[PDB]
């Protein structure tokens, strides 16, 4: 009936101060965003669009798997032509509540 | 591999039982996408009833399904699944589990799980 | 909520003819919401296309979905027989009652 809680990878008392190191996941960001990607080109004389759900870096391309970095698979690029990308940021109707986006808190003990 | 999605069984089950049907999702980060839970009663249209983010079990269900159905997830074996507490004649249907985006359209189904409630 | 209206109920077309179902939204939706489905007698439904006109993998060149804010339309320019079937659009929660393609005889 309740989502899943935050977790705790270490903590630290230093010099009278709590240095926690959470578990993050970013499961709240990862199912309420999404990429709308529009290329245009001369082929393809009219805007094509597509959506991005997953950004991430794995492989097993002759590339890299580091962080700071997002990775995602363009169709409608040729590499003989010039092409023109513009990105957007959408969000997932459905991680609203009444018109709010991550609306409530979450319960944790530090013992 | 593709993505492909795989229901429990065909059920005939009487007014007042239980049920739980699974969704055992393959082919793809299972908990990259939301599972949604479709109705289609005998010869009617599509019913949206519920999805969850198996990520991190958010759960939303539209309207008419709140209270009546209970959408649960296990990350570890890439299945859902759908539940009622006490089944009534009504809950006659095809449901199908489907994965989805976060625009929310369903790109793979399950193959359906026939529910068949009577006395 | 949003409540989508699909016209006409039934479409009776020839093979080879054009079809074009008809999507209208209650409010104005982002077309990245907008999404189309198949169903053929005693099948699992099919996503053709989604974000209004974005077509799945391996959905052929005959499906184009066109339309915004109001007014989506799906077309098939060549009904192939397979081709007959139920249409379904879908923004999120809300559903079309569907269309029928049938073979005009």
């Known amino acids: 009936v309740k989502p899943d809680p935050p977790h705790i990878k270490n903590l630290s008392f230093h010099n009278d101060d709590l240095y926690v190191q959470w578990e993050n996941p970013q499961n709240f960001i990862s199912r309420c965003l999404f990429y709308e990607v529009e290329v245009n080109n001369s082929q393809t004389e009219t805007h094509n669009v597509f959506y991005v759900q997953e950004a991430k870096c794995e492989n097993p391309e002759f590339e890299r798997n580091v962080e700071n970095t997002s990775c995602f698979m363009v169709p409608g690029v040729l590499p003989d032509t010039l092409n023109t990308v513009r990105i957007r940021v959408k969000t997932n109707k459905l991680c609203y509540e009444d018109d709010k986006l991550w609306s409530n808190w979450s319960q944790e003990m530090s013992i | 591999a593709e993505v492909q999605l795989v229901q429990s069984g065909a059920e005939v089950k009487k007014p007042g039982e239980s049920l739980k049907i699974s969704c055992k999702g393959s082919?793809?980060?299972?908990?990259?996408?939301?599972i949604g839970w479709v109705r289609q009663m005998p010869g009617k249209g599509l019913e949206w009833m519920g999805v969850?983010?198996?990520?991190?079990?958010?759960?939303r269900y539209s309207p008419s399904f709140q209270g009546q159905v209970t959408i649960s997830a296990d990350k570890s074996i890439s299945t859902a699944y759908l539940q009622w507490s006490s089944l009534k004649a009504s809950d006659t249907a095809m449901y199908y589990c489907?994965?989805?985006?976060?625009?929310?359209?369903?790109?793979?189904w399950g193959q359906g799980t026939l529910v068949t409630v009577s006395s | 909520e949003v409540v989508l209206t699909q016209s006409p109920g039934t479409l009776s077309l020839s093979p080879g003819e054009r079809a074009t179902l008809s999507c209208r939204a209650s409010q104005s939706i982002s077309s990245s919401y907008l999404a189309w489905y198949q169903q053929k007698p005693g099948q699992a439904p099919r996503l053709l296309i989604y974000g209004a006109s974005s077509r799945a993998t391996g959905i052929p060149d005959r499906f184009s979905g066109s339309g915004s804010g109001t007014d989506f339309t799906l077309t098939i320019s060549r009904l192939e027989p397979e081709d007959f079937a139920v249409y379904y659009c879908?923004?999120?929660?809300?559903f079309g009652q569907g269309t029928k393609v049938e073979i005009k005889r």
């Open positions: 879908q923004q999120y929660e809300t």
């Open positions: 489907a994965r989805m985006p976060n625009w929310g359209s369903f790109d793979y």
């Open positions: 969850i983010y198996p990520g991190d079990s958010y759960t």
């Open positions: 082919g793809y980060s299972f908990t990259s996408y939301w």
